[PDB]
Design a protein around this ligand. Structure first.
Ligand SMILES: *[C@@H]1O[C@H](CO)[C@@H](O[C@@H]2O[C@H](CO)[C@@H](O)[C@H](O)[C@H]2NC(C)=O)[C@H](O)[C@H]1NC(C)=O
Ligand SMILES: *[C@@H]1O[C@H](CO)[C@@H](O[C@@H]2O[C@H](CO)[C@@H](O)[C@H](O)[C@H]2NC(C)=O)[C@H](O)[C@H]1NC(C)=O
Ligand SMILES: *[C@@H]1O[C@H](CO)[C@@H](O[C@@H]2O[C@H](CO)[C@@H](O)[C@H](O)[C@H]2NC(C)=O)[C@H](O)[C@H]1NC(C)=O
Ligand code: CA
Ligand code: CA
Lengths: 158, 53
């Protein structure tokens, strides 16, 4: 439930600011020039360099936990929760007896968008690229994720 | 103010260039590890469940 592909119709509509789809993904302003992008903060991706990737159509940076081709959904928008519930109902009504949710700890992130604490305090800020070089307090296990899981359980209880 | 972080890590200064030993005002630090931690709402709900008897 955490993310979709960049070829999904939701992302294609979101990147052009088309209706309620405009806010299914975490967008933010960023500075891109001469083939270089300045991210809003120093958050790092699990598999690589940065969690913020620039886009051309929207002229903004979107947020991805894992890869640049995996935009992360916005669970602070109730419409996304409604869509997830609809998908769950669609799969439940076909006879599936259970679900195994993957990567539930990555659902919510902090809204203040503050830098995370480095493990090596004296390391130069622009030479940090490994996911293991930062303490992840603002990107994993935020307040309200367990409520989302309980909402999923309540939906399945029907 | 019920729960606090267990890792006991320093909090982010509002003025990043301020000398670390000259910070004494409660308004000079962002309080992310000392207020509204994970599980406080569960404690409040436990209190409500206790009162429900
Ligand atoms: C993104 O991450 C890579 C790998 O973590 C970093 O280094 C690049 O590694 C690839 C693999 O050999 C090289 O082809 C690139 O030339 C490296 N980039 C350099 C040296 O700047 C790097 O942090 C990032 N690389 C890119 C291309 O975005
Ligand atoms: C990473 O932490 C280690 C200690 O935990 C330190 O590494 C030393 O940093 C000095 C500072 O210039 C550099 O000479 C070397 O990187 C390390 N020492 C020596 C003499 O090799 C430091 O806190 C961090 N490392 C870096 C890259 O500075
Ligand atoms: C608090 O923030 C302010 C800006 O937001 C800065 O204050 C300047 O810091 C310089 C650094 O030496 C000092 O000269 C003065 O304290 C301030 N400027 C001057 C010359 O008046 C700085 O980031 C923080 N202030 C302190 C105490 O350094
Ligand atoms: Ca997420
Ligand atoms: Ca307390």
């Amino acid at each position: 439930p955490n993310h979709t592909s960049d070829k999904h119709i939701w992302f294609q509509l979101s990147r052009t600011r088309t209706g309620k789809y405009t806010d299914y993904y975490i967008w933010h302003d960023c500075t891109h020039e001469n083939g270089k992008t300045i991210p809003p903060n120093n958050w790092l991706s699990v598999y690589g360099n940065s969690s913020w990737h620039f886009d051309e159509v929207r002229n903004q940076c979107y947020f991805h936990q894992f890869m640049k081709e995996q935009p992360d959904l916005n669970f602070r928008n109730p419409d996304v929760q409604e869509e997830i519930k609809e998908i769950l109902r669609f799969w439940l009504t076909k006879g599936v007896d259970g679900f195994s949710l993957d990567a539930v700890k990555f659902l919510l992130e902090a809204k203040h968008l503050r830098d995370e604490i480095q493990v090596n305090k004296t390391q130069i800020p622009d030479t940090v690229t490994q996911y293991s070089e930062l303490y992840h307090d603002f990107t994993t296990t935020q307040v309200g994720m367990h409520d989302i899981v309980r909402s999923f359980r309540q939906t399945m209880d029907q």
